[PDB]
Design a protein around this ligand. Structure first.
Ligand SMILES: Nc1ncnc2c1ncn2[C@@H]1O[C@H](COP(=O)(O)OP(=O)(O)OP(=O)(O)O)[C@@H](O)[C@H]1O
Ligand SMILES: Nc1ncnc2c1ncn2[C@@H]1O[C@H](COP(=O)(O)OP(=O)(O)OP(=O)(O)O)[C@@H](O)[C@H]1O
Ligand SMILES: [Mg+2]
Ligand SMILES: [Mg+2]
Lengths: 83, 411, 413, 50
C-alpha cells in the first residue's frame, strides 16, 4: 500500500494485497476495517468498484474458520447488503 | 399460456433462530469462552454496520414528488373494505362491514389484475374511494400458531430411539433434502404420521427435534385450539390453517392431542356435540378429500389410539403408525447417561444398579430421578451425588403408581 | 431433623468450582441474547408494500385527474326498487339494511329503464336515482363451479366393473343418448347415493366423472352451508337451485352430507336448530312443488345409517350404489394399476400378494406399493424384489391386524 | 383548577386492538364495532413499542 501511494482509482488496489495475504484465520479487527472505512457513503458512481472489492475480500477469511463464522457470514450478508 | 400467473409471486419466510448450535465442549472450558466471544464479535459488527447504514445516507428525494402527493392523495385514516363485484369502467362496487355498498371509483396506481370478489381493499372516508388493496388478510389466530424459535436440542438429545427416528426421517427430512431417490421409482413419500403409545415416552420431544433441525416452516396446534362457539367459526379456522400452510413454504403441520378431535363419529342427542363433530369431519375433507394436497405434511400424536375415528386411520390420510413402547435394559442406559451430563458425579455410583433391579418406568421418570437426587445433595450439604441419593430418589419418584395386579395364581 | 439452608451457607456454593469462568461465560451468553433483540429493532424492515402499481404508468392520472376526481365524483350507493306509480316517479326504494325511502328520479336517467327489482345508483343527499345496474350474481357459487379437470381415467377404478356400470346409467347416458329412455317409455333416476367403508373409492368415481362430463359440474363444499347468522345458510341453498335451472343439465356433487344434517330430534328443546333449517330447505328444492327437471344430484358418505329418512326416500335419492371389497380378481387388477409405474423386477407375480390382503381396501393396497419401494431405499437398490413386497405386507397389515394369531398359530396348519 | 376544567372539556378517545403493524408508522386496528383501519402514530409512541 505504501508502494502504490496514488490516486483512489489506483488505490482500488489497496484492498487487494491487504486481504489476499489474509486467506483464513480469526482476525476480526481486519474484518471491521473491511467494513467501517468504505461502508456505504451512497457514493455517486465513483468508488463503487472498491466497495465491491472490499466485499470481495469479506468472502475469504470466512471459508476456513470451519463454519464458526460461516453462519455469521450468511446472517450478515443476507440482511445487511441484499436488504 | 404455459406458466399462468407464475405461482402467486410468493417467497417463503423460514425461521431466524439456530444462529450457532456449536457449543460442543458442553462444560466450563475456555473454548466455550472463546467460541461465544466470536459470536459476540460478529453480532456487534452486524450492529455497527447497520448503524453506519442508517447513518451515512445523504440521499434525499423522498419520492421524487410521485408517492409523496399520493400519500397525501389517500386519506390519513385509511379504512378497510370488501369487493362484491367489478364494474371495470374505473367505477366499481364495494361493501363495508355493515353492508353499505358504494359506487366508488378507482383512484389509480392499482393494477386491476390481483383484485377478486373476496379480496379486501383500502378505502377513504370523505369519498370512500379505492386507494390501495389490503394484502395477506390473515385472521390473528393462525399467526399465533407460527413457530419462530427452535426450542431444544437436536436428535442427539434424546436417549436412543433409532429404529423409529429413521422412520420419521423417511417422511419429513429425507424427501425435502434429497428427492432424487423417489423419482427413480415414481413413489410419492408418505404424508400422515401417528405417534402413539403410553405417556411419558418421547412424543413431544420427537416433534421438537424435527422443528429444530428443519428448513421449511413449522406450525403447532394444541388440541382444542380450533374449537369455537359460533357454529361455523370452528370449520372456518381449519380452512385458513391449511390455506396459510399452502401459500407459504412446502412445510409441515404438527397437530398434537388429536384424541380430543376424534372418537368413532357416532350420532347422539346433544346439539353442541355436532359443531364439535362437524368441524372434525371437514378436517377429513381438507386432508385427503378433493382436489389435491400440495406439499403439506401432518404429524399427529395421542396416548390412546383405539378410541379414534377409523376414517382418519386409513391410508391416504396417514401412512405411518409408530409405537413408542416403554424402554428396555439397554437404551435405558442412554437415558441415564444424557440426563447426567453436566452434573458432578461421584465415582461410587453404578448406573446399572437401578436399571436391572427394577424393570418398569418411563423416560420422564428418569429425568425426575436425576433432579430429585440433585436436590438430595443440597438437602445434606453436598455437591457430588452418590448412590445414597439414587437410593432415596428411586423410592420417592416411583411411589405414585399403585401396588400391584393379581396374586400368585399364575406360576 | 433435616434442614440445611442458612444465608451464610448460600455463599459457600457459588464460589466453589470454576470461580474464574462462571460469570465470565454466563454474561457473554446473556448480553448476546440482548444483542439478538437489539439487532431486530434496529433493522425494522417489515415493508408490507401493497396496492401500488409499478410507478411508471399512473403518472398521467395523478397529476390533475385524481384531484379532478375528488369533488365532482360521487359516492353514490346502490339499492333496490319495490315499484313505481303512474304520471310521476313516486319511486319506493329499500336498502334491506337502512330505511325505505320514497324519492325522485334525476335528470340523467331515462324514465323507461327504472323497472322493479332493479339495482340503481342512488344519491347520498337527495337520494335520486342516477345509474341503473346489471343484476347481482351470487359470488360464492362462482367460487365452487370447478372449471378444472382432475386427471383420473376410468381405467384407474379397477375392481368396480359393475358399480361404474350402475353409475354410467344415471349420469352419462341420458346426457349423450336422450332417446332410448323416451323411445321405450322410461325415465332415468336423478339422485344417486354412494355408501360403504372408507378408502374404498368414493372420491375416485366422483373425481373421474369430472374428467368425462362435457357438462356443468359443481363441487359443493359442505360446511359453507353452515353459517354464523340465522337463515343465511338457507339462502345459500336457494341461489344454488336457481342458476341450475338457467343453463341445461348441470351436475351437482355434494360430499359428506352426514355433516349438513342427519337426524331431526328435539328433546332437550334446542341444539342443531339452524342446521335443520338449511337441511329442510334442501329438501323442498329437491322435491315438492316446481320439480327441478334436469338437475342430477350425487352424494357420498361413510356413515349411511345416521341419515334422515326424508333423504332416504326415492324421488330424492333413487339409486343406492354401494362399494365393497374386491374379492380376488379386483385386487390383482389393482396391484397392476398402482405398481406399473415403478421400477420392479419384471418376473414377479401379483396373485400371491392378493392372497395376503384378505380384507383390504384400494387405499391399503397402494400403501403396500409405496412401502415396498421404501425398503429399497433402506438398502441400496433401484428395483423392487419379491421379498420387498413380502416385508411390506407384514409392515402394513400384520403389524396392526394380528399379533396373537401369528406366533401362536398352531391350530390351523 | 381552570387548567383542570379546560382539559376535561374535550372529546373522548377510542379504544381499539392492534392486530399487527404496517411499515412506516402505520398499524392495523379494528375498533370495536367497525371495519379495520390503517392509521398514523403520534410522536411519543413508536413502532417497536407496539
Ligand atoms: N427417549 C428419551 N430420551 C431422553 N429423554 C426422554 C426420553 N423420553 C422422554 N424423555 C423425557 O420426557 C420429557 C418429554 O415428555 P414426552 O415427550 O414423553 O411427553 P409426551 O409423550 O407428549 O407425554 P404425554 O403423551 O403424556 O403428553 C422430556 O423432558 C425428556 O427429558
Ligand atoms: N378400486 C380402486 N382401484 C384403484 N385404486 C383405489 C381403489 N379404491 C381406492 N383406491 C385408492 O385409494 C385412495 C383413496 O381412496 P378414496 O379416498 O377415493 O376412498 P373414499 O372411499 O373416497 O374415502 P372416504 O370414504 O373417506 O371419502 C385413492 O387415491 C385411490 O388411489
Ligand atoms: Mg404430549
Ligand atoms: Mg372420499
Amino acid at each position: 500500500a505504501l508502494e502504490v501511494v496514488s490516486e483512489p482509482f489506483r488505490s482500488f488496489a489497496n484492498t487487494l494485497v491487504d486481504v489476499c495475504a489474509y486467506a483464513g484465520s480469526g482476525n476480526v479487527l481486519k474484518v471491521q476495517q473491511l467494513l467501517h472505512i468504505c461502508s456505504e457513503h451512497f457514493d455517486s458512481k465513483e468508488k463503487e468498484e472498491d466497495k465491491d472489492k472490499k466485499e470481495k475480500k469479506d468472502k475469504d477469511k470466512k471459508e476456513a474458520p470451519a463454519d464458526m463464522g460461516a453462519h455469521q457470514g450468511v446472517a450478515v450478508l443476507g440482511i445487511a447488503l441484499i436488504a | 399460456p404455459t406458466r399462468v400467473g407464475k405461482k402467486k409471486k410468493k417467497t417463503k419466510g423460514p425461521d431466524a433462530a439456530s444462529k450457532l448450535p456449536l457449543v460442543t465442549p458442553h462444560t466450563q472450558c475456555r473454548l466455550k469462552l472463546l467460541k461465544l466471544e466470536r459470536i459476540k464479535d460478529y453480532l456487534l459488527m452486524e450492529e455497527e454496520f447497520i448503524r453506519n447504514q442508517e447513518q451515512m445516507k445523504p440521499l434525499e428525494e423522498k419520492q421524487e414528488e410521485e408517492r409523496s402527493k399520493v400519500d397525501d392523495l389517500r386519506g390519513t385514516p385509511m379504512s378497510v373494505g370488501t369487493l362484491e363485484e367489478i364494474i371495470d369502467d374505473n367505477h366499481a362496487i364495494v361493501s363495508t362491514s355493515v353492508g353499505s355498498e358504494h359506487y366508488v371509483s378507482i383512484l389509480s396506481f392499482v393494477d386491476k389484475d390481483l383484485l377478486e370478489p373476496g379480496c379486501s381493499v383500502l378505502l377513504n372516508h370523505k369519498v370512500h374511494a379505492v386507494i390501495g388493496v389490503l394484502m395477506d388478510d390473515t385472521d390473528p389466530l393462525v399467526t399465533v400458531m407460527k413457530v419462530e424459535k427452535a426450542p431444544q436440542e437436536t436428535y442427539a438429545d434424546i436417549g436412543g430411539l433409532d429404529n423409529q427416528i429413521q422412520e420419521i426421517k423417511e417422511s419429513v427430512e429425507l424427501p425435502l433434502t434429497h428427492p432424487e431417490y423417489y423419482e427413480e421409482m415414481g413413489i410419492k413419500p408418505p404424508k400422515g404420521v401417528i405417534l402413539y403409545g403410553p405417556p411419558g415416552t418421547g412424543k413431544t420431544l420427537l416433534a421438537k427435534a424435527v422443528a429444530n433441525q428443519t428448513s421449511a416452516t413449522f406450525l403447532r396446534v394444541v388440541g382444542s385450539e380450533l374449537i369455537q362457539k359460533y357454529l361455523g367459526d370452528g370449520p372456518k379456522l381449519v380452512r385458513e390453517l391449511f390455506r396459510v400452510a399452502e401459500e407459504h413454504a412446502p412445510s409441515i403441520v404438527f397437530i398434537d392431542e388429536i384424541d380430543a378431535i376424534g372418537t368413532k363419529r357416532y350420532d347422539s342427542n346433544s346439539g353442541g356435540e355436532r359443531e364439535i363433530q362437524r368441524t372434525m369431519l371437514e378436517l377429513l375433507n381438507q386432508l385427503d378429500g378433493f382436489d389435491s394436497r400440495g406439499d403439506v405434511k401432518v404429524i399427529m400424536a395421542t396416548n390412546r389410539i383405539e378410541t379414534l375415528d377409523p376414517a382418519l386411520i386409513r391410508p391416504g390420510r396417514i401412512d405411518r403408525k409408530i409405537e413408542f413402547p416403554l424402554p428396555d435394559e439397554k437404551t435405558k442406559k442412554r437415558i441415564f447417561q444424557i440426563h447426567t451430563s453436566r452434573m458432578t458425579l461421584a465415582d461410587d455410583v453404578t448406573l446399572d444398579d437401578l436399571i436391572m433391579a427394577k424393570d418398569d418406568l418411563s423416560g420422564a421418570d428418569i429425568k425426575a430421578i436425576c433432579t430429585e437426587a440433585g436436590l438430595m445433595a443440597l438437602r445434606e450439604r453436598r455437591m457430588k451425588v452418590t448412590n445414597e441419593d439414587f437410593k432415596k430418589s428411586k423410592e420417592n419418584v416411583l411411589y405414585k403408581k399403585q401396588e400391584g395386579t393379581p396374586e400368585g395364581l399364575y406360576l | 431433623p433435616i434442614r440445611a439452608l442458612d444465608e451464610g451457607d448460600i455463599a459457600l456454593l457459588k464460589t466453589y468450582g470454576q470461580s474464574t469462568y462462571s460469570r465470565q461465560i454466563k454474561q457473554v451468553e446473556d448480553d448476546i441474547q440482548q444483542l439478538l433483540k437489539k439487532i431486530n429493532e434496529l433493522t425494522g424492515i417489515k415493508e408490507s408494500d401493497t396496492g401500488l402499481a409499478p410507478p411508471a404508468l399512473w403518472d398521467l392520472a395523478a397529476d390533475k385527474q385524481t384531484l379532478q376526481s375528488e369533488q365532482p365524483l360521487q359516492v353514490a350507493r346502490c339499492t333496490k326498487i319495490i315499484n313505481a306509480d303512474s304520471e310521476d316517479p313516486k319511486y319506493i326504494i329499500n336498502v334491506k339494511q337502512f330505511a325505505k325511502f320514497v324519492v325522485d328520479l334525476s335528470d340523467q336517467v331515462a324514465p323507461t329503464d327504472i323497472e322493479e327489482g332493479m339495482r340503481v345508483g342512488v344519491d347520498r343527499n337527495k337520494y335520486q336515482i342516477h345509474i341503473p345496474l346489471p343484476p347481482k350474481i351470487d359470488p360464492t357459487v362462482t367460487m365452487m363451479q370447478v372449471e378444472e379437470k382432475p386427471d383420473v381415467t376410468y381405467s384407474d377404478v379397477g375392481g368396480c366393473k359393475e358399480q361404474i356400470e350402475k353409475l354410467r346409467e344415471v349420469v352419462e347416458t341420458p346426457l349423450l343418448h336422450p332417446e332410448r329412455f323416451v323411445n321405450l317409455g322410461i325415465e332415468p333416476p336423478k339422485g344417486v347415493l354412494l355408501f360403504g367403508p372408507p378408502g374404498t373409492g368414493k372420491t375416485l368415481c366422483a373425481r373421474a366423472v369430472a374428467n368425462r362430463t362435457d357438462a356443468c359440474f359443481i363441487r359443493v363444499i359442505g360446511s359453507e352451508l353452515v353459517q354464523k347468522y340465522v337463515g343465511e345458510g338457507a339462502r345459500m341453498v336457494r341461489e344454488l337451485f336457481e342458476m341450475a335451472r338457467t343453463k341445461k343439465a348441470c351436475l351437482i356433487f355434494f360430499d359428506e352430507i352426514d355433516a349438513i344434517g342427519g337426524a331431526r330430534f328435539d328433546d332437550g328443546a334446542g341444539g342443531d336448530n339452524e342446521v335443520q333449517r338449511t337441511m329442510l330447505e334442501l329438501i323442498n328444492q329437491l322435491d315438492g312443488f316446481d320439480p327441478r327437471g334436469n338437475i342430477k344430484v350425487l352424494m357420498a358418505t361413510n356413515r349411511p345409517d345416521t341419515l334422515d329418512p326424508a333423504l332416504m326416500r326415492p324421488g330424492r335419492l333413487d339409486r343406492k350404489i354401494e362399494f365393497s371389497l374386491p374379492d380376488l380378481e379386483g385386487r390383482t387388477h389393482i396391484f397392476k394399476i398402482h405398481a406399473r409405474s415403478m421400477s420392479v423386477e419384471r418376473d414377479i407375480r401379483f396373485e400371491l400378494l392378493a392372497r395376503l390382503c384378505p380384507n383390504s381396501t384400494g387405499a391399503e393396497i397402494r400403501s403396500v406399493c409405496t412401502e415396498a419401494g421404501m425398503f429399497a431405499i433402506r438398502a441400496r437398490r433401484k428395483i423392487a424384489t419379491e421379498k420387498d413386497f413380502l416385508e411390506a405386507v407384514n409392515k402394513v397389515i400384520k403389524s396392526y391386524a394380528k399379533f396373537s394369531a401369528t406366533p401362536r398359530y398352531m391350530t390351523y396348519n | 383548577l381552570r387548567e383542570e376544567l379546560q382539559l376535561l372539556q374535550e372529546q373522548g378517545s377510542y379504544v381499539g386492538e392492534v392486530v399487527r403493524a404496517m411499515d412506516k408508522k402505520k398499524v392495523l386496528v379494528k375498533v370495536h364495532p367497525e371495519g379495520k383501519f390503517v392509521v398514523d402514530v403520534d410522536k411519543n409512541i413508536d413502532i417497536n413499542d407496539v
